[PDB]
Symmetry: C3
Subunit: 710 residues, 3 copies
């Protein structure tokens, strides 16, 4: 019956074990205030067929996030919301690096919101619960880890703020740390604040995570556990690594020394060397798993790359530690687009499109779907696309692609603090990668800032983003970082063989978003501060380059900019205009794409993406309040039309069955309003001659006349 | 050309074949009254890659049963509604046991509703059509089977009733009889009916299914189809079985005879013996399929388990045939939940949560997708969750597992009869299994009964559910049943090795739900009656235990429970408050979770999950609709209002964030006719005495005016 | 196939009708030319249901068999097949689905 209480300033965290799902390898329950979340972790024993960590983590959304109840194709959830994906990705990036290397077994972690009071957020509870469950199970781990959230309100740091304080907070930061004050997960979003407060918040967060770790360590020592022994660790044998190094170090050094190489050429050369070395190894040791050979080669390559970076300060192209690739920016690519931006840094190249849309477009039909998806505070949201062909790869274009969603959320959080408070239309920023060479999220946010800058949306201090990489040479005994180097504007290979990824974006004088992905098992805060400083310098340079192209937003939107207007509809014609159940409007809404709403019984708001579409819709409205339905009728021309229907105010006459019946009205039948058209020889099935005269818009009648024939 | 008519009291079943879908292995058409359904069965001729019966049955649908057309994802019923899932599960549990053992070939059975009239339901017709198609095709079988549905109206057992009958019946039973009067599949839902009536209904149904069996036999004799011979049956060799038995019977008896074992330890010992036995077999017959070895070992284990059960009357852990494992119940686990219950029957443990919700939540956005499923006449519905960690397993959490959906439907039918007639809120009973050891469906039903018992829902006679297993020593010479034993509250292993499974739920006097799937090719009625008696005794005992911890539900639900309030919004500001196209309302809803409905042009209904949520919502509308949210009080009470902002001709005053900040005029505010109210001292926060004239359409809000005050 | 059948049947529908029209076709035995068969059967079904149409709609399939010369990639001899069977389609060179009126 493990149970412990941890005090954080004002909040109390109750961590409990047992009593709930004892069959799982690790079960934990974290309770804060009145809400509580239960986390389970289960790992198999048979080694996975795949040669890598098949770790999966899931965060099941529940009802009381706002007091609503979630309904989907599963009546609770199919797919996820953005929030679930973000929380799952946070938990993954927080717990994965602590796992021992070479551990290749299925491992699934679930977290369920047992009960939500709507006062305390459950995600920061979920991370701690996952840490407890892992540390308390037989699964090997190097944890435990402790996660806290820091907000800033009225110049004061608050640990684990409530939702009410969340709304008014100018900063929302999530810090997950390791024992001995090692940071493992940083995720922050602030409203363009200075870096000094950022450093202070980071220090406070790590200080509190130390207390959390103290408490959980006390619990695990109290209850006592015994980590299971994995049947096999998939680490490469030291002898194979030694032979691979002695066989390929010179060639790898040679191919990494020259600075005339794109991604493709360098990858091809290293792949050829890999083929030769793999053949040599298979000849030398025809008794080992081929994956072991591949892993040995990869380890040798990573070691060589890290060594050359550490000892020569030229990463792979002659760039120093603090530099960046060439940057090119283009705006206004196509007239028909509200805003176009093309941002190309080095090999990486992305395109961002800004398209306006009606406010009502941001709300779905049913309440439940809107609630689960939520509504952005500012009427603005950004979509991020990563098609496979951007990396010369073939893959399923559709689906979810959680990495795409995470990158989109990151970029949207980066761009958020500069969107103006209100706008007549919803901002729909769309960015997609075209040539992917790493740091695509920062480039996408940068290009989106450029596109918004072009579309005339009044913003301030166009945002710029940058990535930071870290290379460490550490002792094998204590794991202490003996030496470290920082890299600015990393490449794909730099990230792949690096130790951590640090994507940070901000304005000319503040930081907006931060998402530090670290693969090492924890790093000291000093490295983080150095990264922040270098990133600030790089951001200044990038902003200089951008402002060299475009600085102030355009005075007005493009002539193709959407227009919102009002239309007056009399009550008498109101029913005819709206149609049964508003069907006509829907049809019109689906015909030209304009959006029609009503403000009162008479005024109607009309939103149109293009002025031409607006004028067309206005003509359609004028027609609707007028008369219509004419087909193949001429003035003074005899038409051999066969009558089909009999009605008081006219006859539905068709020239032939393949023609919409037109109203031959009695009022134009001998110029006398009758309820019996047959008085003028209007007999169904008779090949009469019908002559058109005009129209009656207000009366809603046709001027068809058989009187000329009769 | 097969055509045969079968008479059931007053209904005619026309079975036809050879006219449509002649390409399929077996095609049948069943016509009752004017509803016709065609069923096709196709089986491959190659052994499946898997090593088990890969039966797949699908029951398509046309939504014309209510007259509408299915348009969930396409203009058909591609959405796989819950009713379709239940029907498919019924078909599977009705036809699977009749297949010969070891038949491992892909086999798919599809049902298409050729024509429905809303008078005769097609499901039972679908079962009969599947039976006919299988019996008439070359696929080996031991049928045919005959399915009927029995209803009770005014003490009369009607057979195959019409929809109006289903509406008026107190019982709905479905029987899948087999030749020589054997029951294969039983599925019944009654509105808390007695026991002997249930027995009589079972007898009538099994008597009636003989006629349809006779008809199908006549048809198949007329056509004279010849079954194909399978290329290879996958039953283990008898001699290998003999060797495995002689090798492992001692150890298996030793492990199964002790009474100190959870599920995990017993499974571990079984697997431990399995490894050595497999090694011995490999050393003995290094020429057989390894899966044959696995099957031989499993057969030996099942045989010895059944033998020990039959001969010693002690199943496991010292429990006799009738006694059931321990049960513990807890209520009110968390304050914020509307109702919480925790049930722990032996090793199985399930948590049940009940949360209220608005009636409008039970209706989807459009109409067509709403009609794909019912509306649950007694406003109530159950959600069932079977996460993989409940059984220490790994699996996808999303994808609509048919087993979990069927179990949830069974629990919902079990709990339906005791729900009160009407209730101001929809009831959502969520049950998630945590420790899974079999019979989790009845445990979930009991937990939901407890949760309702706790949330103050005025229900009667808390429902209890139990499971029953059967172990028989059949004679392969005649296929008869020589000795049988009935087990109460089976474990997972007992179900796995048992001949069948029975689930019975009911009140202190009656029976509500009854699902009985049998893995044997039919069983006599006597066994069913014995199972009914045993389940009745067990239900009495379980209710006796349950009532100790809770009874006579709480007079009122928890104060955190939802509240419903009336609101008055006169027209002039009704237009503003609703906003363009109601957008404002939606903007409120997803941002606070409150639900707003328009009672009429003047009144609105407000539904809030918590009183705190209601206060938050009214304050949000206070701060977001340019005015304040409004609450209904007695008209004609002099109050005092604080000033939010100062106007030249008036004020924007309000009393609390629960009545609209009302614009006042000089004739209403300033009796001194001064352009500056600040002369009187009117400032932000200053109280002014106002008269509550009530909500009037002239202003669009409550008429707050000081005609004689100040 | 559904879109092809729908476009085939489109020009024989009156400009207006009091109700939406849903033409659902299900295949039961496939031996090629299923789309034209579905369209023609839908023509019959609409014809029966009472909704007026300009005329009946008939669909057909055409196959082609060519003895090409690989040395030049030319068409030496060709033969046309009416109402192509499934095997002919599978081993043929092309498929032609065409529908119309009288």
């Amino acid at each position: 019956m493990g149970a412990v209480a941890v005090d954080l300033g004002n909040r109390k965290l109750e961590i409990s074990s047992g009593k709930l799902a004892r069959f799982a390898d690790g079960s934990a329950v974290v309770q804060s205030g009145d809400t509580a979340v239960m986390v389970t972790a289960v790992s198999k024993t048979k080694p996975s067929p795949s040669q890598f960590m098949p770790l999966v983590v899931d965060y099941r959304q529940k009802a009381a996030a706002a007091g609503r109840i979630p309904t989907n194709y599963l009546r609770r959830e199919v797919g996820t919301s953005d929030k679930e994906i973000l929380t799952s990705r946070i938990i993954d990036r927080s717990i994965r690096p602590l796992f021992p290397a070479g551990y290749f077994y299925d491992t699934q972690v679930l977290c369920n919101l047992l009960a939500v009071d709507g006062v305390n957020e459950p995600d920061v509870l979920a991370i701690n619960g996952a840490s407890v469950a892992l540390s308390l199970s037989d699964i090997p781990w190097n944890g435990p880890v402790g996660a806290v959230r820091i907000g800033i309100i009225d110049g004061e740091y608050v640990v684990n703020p409530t939702r009410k304080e969340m709304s008014s907070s100018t900063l929302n930061l999530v810090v997950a740390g390791a024992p001995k004050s090692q940071i493992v997960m940083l995720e922050a979003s602030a409203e363009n604040i200075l870096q000094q407060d950022f450093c202070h918040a980071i220090k406070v967060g790590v200080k509190y995570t130390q207390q959390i770790i103290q408490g959980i360590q006390q619990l695990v020592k109290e209850t006592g556990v015994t980590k299971r022994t994995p049947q096999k660790l998939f680490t490469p044998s030291p002898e194979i690594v030694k032979y691979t190094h002695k066989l390929a170090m010179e060639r790898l050094y040679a191919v990494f020394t020259d600075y005339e190489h794109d991604k493709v050429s360098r990858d091809e050369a290293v792949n050829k060397i890999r083929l030769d070395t793999e053949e040599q190894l298979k000849e030398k040791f025809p008794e080992a798993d081929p994956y072991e050979i591949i892993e040995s080669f990869n380890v040798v390559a990573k070691e060589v790359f890290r060594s050359i970076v550490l000892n020569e300060y030229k990463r792979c192209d002659g760039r120093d530690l603090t530099s960046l690739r060439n940057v090119s920016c283009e705006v206004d690519m196509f007239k028909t687009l509200h805003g176009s931006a093309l941002f190309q840094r080095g090999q990486t190249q992305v395109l961002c499109t800004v398209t306006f849309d009606s406010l009502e477009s941001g709300i779905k039909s049913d309440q439940v779907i809107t609630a689960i998806n939520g509504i952005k505070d500012k009427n603005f949201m950004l979509h991020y696309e990563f098609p496979p062909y951007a990396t010369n790869e073939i893959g399923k274009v559709t689906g979810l692609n959680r990495r795409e969603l995470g990158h989109g959320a990151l970029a949207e959080k980066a761009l958020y603090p500069v969107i103006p408070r209100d706008f007549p239309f919803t901002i729909r920023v769309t960015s997609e990668v075209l040539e992917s060479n790493g740091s695509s999220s920062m480039a996408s946010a940068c290009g989106g800032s450029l596109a918004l800058m072009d579309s005339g949306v009044p913003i301030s201090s166009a945002v710029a983003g940058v990535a930071i990489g870290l290379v460490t040479k550490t002792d094998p005994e204590k794991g202490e970082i003996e030496d470290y180097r920082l890299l600015t504007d990393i490449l794909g290979i730099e990230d792949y063989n690096g130790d951590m990824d640090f994507k940070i974006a901000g304005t000319n004088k503040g930081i907006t978003a931060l998402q530090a992905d670290i693969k090492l098992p924890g790093i000291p805060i000093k490295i983080v501060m150095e990264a922040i400083q270098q990133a600030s310098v790089a951001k200044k340079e990038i902003l200089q380059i951008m402002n060299k192209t475009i600085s102030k937003p355009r005075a007005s939107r493009k002539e193709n900019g959407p227009v919102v207007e009002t239309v007056q509809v009399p009550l008498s014609k109101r029913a005819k205009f709206v149609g049964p159940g508003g069907y006509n409007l829907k049809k019109l809404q689906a015909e030209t794409g304009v959006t029609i709403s009503q403000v009162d019984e008479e005024t109607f708001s009309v939103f149109a993406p293009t002025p031409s579409a607006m004028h067309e819709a206005r003509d359609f409205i004028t027609e609707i309040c007028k008369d219509d339905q004419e087909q193949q009728l001429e003035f003074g021309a005899v038409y051999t039309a066969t009558i089909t229907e009999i009605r008081d105010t006219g006859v539905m006459v068709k020239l032939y069955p393949n023609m919409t019946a037109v109203l031959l009205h009695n009022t134009q039948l001998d110029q006398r309003k009758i309820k019996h058209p047959t008085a003028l020889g209007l007999e169904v099935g008779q090949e009469i001659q019908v002559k058109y005269f005009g129209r009656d818009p207000a009366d809603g009648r046709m001027r068809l006349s058989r009187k000329v024939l009769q």
